[PDB]
Design a protein around this ligand. Structure first.
Ligand SMILES: [Ca+2]
Length: 258
């Protein structure tokens, strides 16, 4: 599963084509490889899950404003409602979903309405209703829940929080330099839930993802159907505000853990 096939939206295709010592934006994105035709067209992308044994996935939507210019006022109105009623409008980001290995301690406290199990795996899908119902006060706990893998020691969970903080510092620095406007893009977090793989790699976790063409965790930026390059227009303040909040949250994870 080296590759992903995503239905092509012309604006997302144009964004990948336009893009592809602070890191450049492209280094956060999946590698775009081309298109496949059916006709139905698909974007062919690097699979960000490739190489993980038990990937644990967190999708976060970036921005207070959640519509672009091309939006019909019907969806413009729907998107203002989403922003106004979730952490998007207050904090600049919201949890969109997760797919994580179930932790018995977690499952006991989480409402049945917030997730979908299966018999065929140890994985739960944490749904949109969960992410939309997070408040400014409990959203930090929701992120700590993501990391609460039953197979990882407290030392490894902490390492990951620290590594992702560093990625957020680097991503913030990238965003100060990029002249783009990105609407409803996601940061995609992935970490390795299999501690045999932590053994194999001796707990060494690359800050930046290996260039695909020529990791125990990764942070990526995905979903560019409402993105475009905007040279001369300055940095994306809308997105950076969400990043600023994530930085505060992740720095707080490190408090008290001397
Ligand atoms: Ca080893």
């Amino acid at each position: 599963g080296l590759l992903i096939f995503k239905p092509a939206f012309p604006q997302e295709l144009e964004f990948y084509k336009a893009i592809q010592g602070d890191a450049p934006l492209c280094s956060w994105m999946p590698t775009y490889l081309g298109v496949l035709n059916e006709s139905k067209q698909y974007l062919v992308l690097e699979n960000l899950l490739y190489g993980f044994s038990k990937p644990n996935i967190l999708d976060i939507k970036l921005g207070k404003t959640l519509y672009d210019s091309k939006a019909s006022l019907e969806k413009r109105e729907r998107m203002k409602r989403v922003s106004e009623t979730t952490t998007s409008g207050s904090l600049g980001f919201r949890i969109c979903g997760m797919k994580i290995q179930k932790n018995p301690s977690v499952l006991n406290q989480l409402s049945l309405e917030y997730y979908e199990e299966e018999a065929d795996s140890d994985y739960i899908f944490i749904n949109k209703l969960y992410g939309r119902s997070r408040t400014d006060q409990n959203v930090s706990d929701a992120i700590e829940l993501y990391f609460n893998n039953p197979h990882l020691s407290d030392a490894r969970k902490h390492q990951l929080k620290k590594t992702f903080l560093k990625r957020l510092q680097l991503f913030y620095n990238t965003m100060l330099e990029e002249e783009v406007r990105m609407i409803s893009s996601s940061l995609l977090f992935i970490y390795e839930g299999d501690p045999e793989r932590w053994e194999l790699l001796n707990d060494v976790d690359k800050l930046m993802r290996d260039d695909f063409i020529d990791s125990l965790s990764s942070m990526s930026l995905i979903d560019f159907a409402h993105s475009e390059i905007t040279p001369g227009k300055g940095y994306d303040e809308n997105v950076i505000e969400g990043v600023e909040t994530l930085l505060d949250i992740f720095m707080k994870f490190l408090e008290h853990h001397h």
